[PDB]
């Protein structure tokens, strides 16, 4: 029967074999060609239609054919795979967006394809392109009325995801397209928070260029605190040339930043620990007065207590071991 021929059709489409395809759906009845073109094939949890697969694989030839001659539905939904995981509620356009197949995308759009369709997780194809970072698609999608405000299931904006990856060009474009930089997320995060977690110094600039608010994480984390805790020394410095709470925010960020050099085994630099830890102690001690509420010793970090005065810190400067502990103690205080 036809569940067999259906594959032979799904095959050709997936592989871009436009000739094989065309030959396969000639002298076929309209009732038949609809069945074949709409069949949903499962190739490893991947439920897809011929259109959808060819759109996912960048087979413009096959894609043009399906649309021009056979005039298959542009809204066919499906469940496709991308680098391991499988997304649900996808249209050909969604696959072509995140797969960077600009040629396929224009063609899909030019043949009247919903640019604002929302997958199961409510992910615009624009969202896909902002993840991928194929700026031309982004531009072109936006030029064809793709709504930027549409976030995801968790209120992750296209702006955020781009700030997560390093897509400085895309972020800047979205900002000019007036994407709200102060959008918040379920976890209570801003594009600024994300790029601050990464070390996306260029993007953190543009957000600041665009008067991004300093909000708090659902954890109670400024973008600064995030970056200092994520051990992104540069970002911290930049972000600190702005309206940081006079001393409290500042000293904490420095204290945490320096502590994050003892904890983080990737970036591990104790010298940088004492540098920032001693810096912060100074900010604490120029008016004498801002003072440290120190926690009691514990077995966890040796029966040690954090330093409260510069002289206490100055003594540790040469004790690689003691400094390692201090950073832990310090981080323990600021975070818990
Ligand atoms: C759950 C949330 C709504 C979300 C939606 C789509 C993506 N998209 C990709 O991860 C991707 C990567 N590479 C190519 C194409 N797409 C990520 C997160």
Author numbering: 0 to 287, 290 to 337
From the paper:
Protein fem‐1 homolog B (FEM1B) is a substrate recognition protein of the Cullin‐RING (CUL2) E3 ligase and plays a critical role in regulating proteins in the cell (Chen et al., 2021, 2024; Hughes et al., 2021; Kramer & Zhang, 2022; Manford et al., 2021; Raiff et al., 2025; Zhao et al., 2021). FEM1B plays a crucial role in balancing the reductive stress response in the cell by degrading key proteins involved in redox sensing and management (Manford et al., 2021). FEM1B binds multiple degron substrates with distinct recognition sequences, which suggests FEM1B has multiple recognition sites for substrate binding. Here, we describe the development of a stable construct of FEM1B, the results of a protein‐observed NMR‐based fragment screen using this construct, and the X‐ray structures of some of the fragment hits when bound to the protein.
The X‐ray structures were determined for six additional molecules (VU0412674, VU0417412, VU0421763, VU0023775, VU0081201, and VU0432623) in complex with FEM1B. The six additional molecules which are classified as chemical shift pattern 3 sit in the same binding pocket. The other six fragments bound to the same site in the FEM1B substrate binding pocket, a region typically important for identifying C‐terminal prolines of degron substrates in a non‐covalent manner. When the most potent non‐covalent molecules, VU0412674 (KD = 0.26 mM) and VU0417412 (KD = 0.28 mM), are bound to FEM1B, Tyr84 forms a polar contact with the amide carbonyl of the molecules. This, along with Phe130, causes this portion of the binding pocket to “close,” locking the fragments in place. The position of Y84 appears to have a significant impact, with the “closed” position providing an increase in binding affinity by locking the molecule in place.
